[PDB]
């Protein structure tokens, strides 16, 4: 196909030699889902600005307002290094010698009487 | 191509039919 032969070149440019045949079919299904939610929001933004033609600033708005919600990322390095030094300053606690099975408080564990219904 | 290994395998170069024993005695 046309758009399915370009999908095998996006993977081969990323060095993916081996892949399942259903991999191309659902990256095209995601790419179709992504463009019919940019352009669906683009004509919502065009009707907000009251213009009959969806021009390039509408797609510039609908991309950056969908990328502000959908595609997130891990926390940044200046945020990870601040919560590290706030946590790594606290000294390590000592251990009670014969406390038993060392566990968190019981509202943080998964150890409850764990009931079930009576069969009748 | 006549120097291919198969040409020299003795199934293709031997009258092995003569071996089949018919009514031996």
């Amino acid at each position: 196909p046309k758009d399915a032969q370009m999908m095998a070149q996006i993977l081969k440019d990323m060095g993916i030699t081996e892949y399942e045949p259903r991999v191309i079919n659902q990256m095209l299904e995601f790419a179709f889902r992504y463009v019919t939610t940019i352009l669906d929001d683009a004509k919502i933004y065009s009707s907000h600005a009251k213009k009959a033609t969806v021009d390039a600033d509408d797609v510039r708005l609908a991309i950056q307002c969908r990328a502000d919600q959908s595609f997130t990322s891990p926390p940044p390095r200046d945020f990870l290094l601040d919560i590290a030094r706030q946590r790594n300053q606290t000294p390590l606690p000592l251990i009670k010698p014969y406390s038993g099975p060392r566990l968190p408080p019981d509202r943080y564990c998964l150890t409850a009487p764990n009931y079930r219904l009576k069969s009748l | 191509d006549l120097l291919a290994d198969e040409n020299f395998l003795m199934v293709t170069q031997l009258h092995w039919e003569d071996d089949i024993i018919w009514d031996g005695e």
């Binding site: 996006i10 259903r22 991999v23 299904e29 995601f30 940019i38 352009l39 959908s70 595609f71 | 039919e17």
Partner: protein
Amino acid sequence: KLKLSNTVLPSESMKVVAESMGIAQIQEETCQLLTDEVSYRIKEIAQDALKFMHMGKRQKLTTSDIDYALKLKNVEPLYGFHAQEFIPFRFASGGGRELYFYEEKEVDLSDIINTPLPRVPLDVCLKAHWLSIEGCQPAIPENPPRLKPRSIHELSVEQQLYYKEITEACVGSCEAKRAEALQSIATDPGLYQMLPRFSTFISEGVRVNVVQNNLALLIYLMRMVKALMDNPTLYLEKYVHELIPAVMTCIVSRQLCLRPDVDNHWALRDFAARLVAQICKHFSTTTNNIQSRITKTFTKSWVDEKTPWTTRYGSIAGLAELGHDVIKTLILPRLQQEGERIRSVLDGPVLSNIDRIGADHVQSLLLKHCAPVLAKLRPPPDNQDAYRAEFGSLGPLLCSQVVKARAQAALQ
């Protein structure tokens, strides 16, 4: 040298999607703006789905890797639908859509119900074996592969003792011993470099074992040949020039021992020999050497006047098991001769010879082959007396065999 490029999706696919949605009259710079954004998100996910491939220790990107790569980027793994509320399915993968390019795009709703469900495979188990014994890798099936000096034999004494045990087990004194020895022949990877001595033991054995027609000795040797053939490791067509005249002799030879009684096995000796004969013509095939040579010997065994009837029955079986077209092209112009031979055995009173038994077996085999040869190339109309144009050998019983074949086809 690296000529790495940046491949994006085509823009002429993005205008088709836009005008099939209600957004008409889009510019090219508007349309190029769509295809570099979505081609980045495909590249961002396929680079992120390659993290799950490496972590799962696979070299193939499965369909579930993109489901976790999408969930990692806070996008729902759902592909077919998108739920604005997101509450019915929250980042839950539905496994994609089983769709094709060459699909039918319309099915009947009772076709999907009546098909049998695939078999759930075996659960995961833990088996242990040995990669290395003090440095050496064993050849188990869980592993992949001036006086001149006094010379040594090319076999070890463990290998020579193994050959002696396997050959003394394969002469069938005990049946469990045979069966293991046959499986040992069927899957020993190191059974090459011992194969000349096995081929010579087979060949020499049949020839001094037809001097007195010792049927077991022969049935065990034919099973040894069959166990030699299905071994995938060894290279056999260097030794097939000894293997083939041994099997032809089992099929085309007279029986020196009691003519009746074990003729039932004799038919199987000719059944096992014709099976391995057509398996040898299936493999080892080059132009006009093996299959045509045994076909020519079988046909001049057939057209030979006044044959031994044991040889006749064996050659008939041998030409019979050669496949679809061979009986379609060879058994056709010969029915009258077969009928005349049957009539001669019937008329002559002589009953204490083996001629009558040979005739009955030959006629039954020929009639079964003729039945599908007919079921295969014509409709089943006029199955009562039209076969009387072919001397009336099998007739209505042949028609009943064709009907049974049709019932088996309906069951399939």
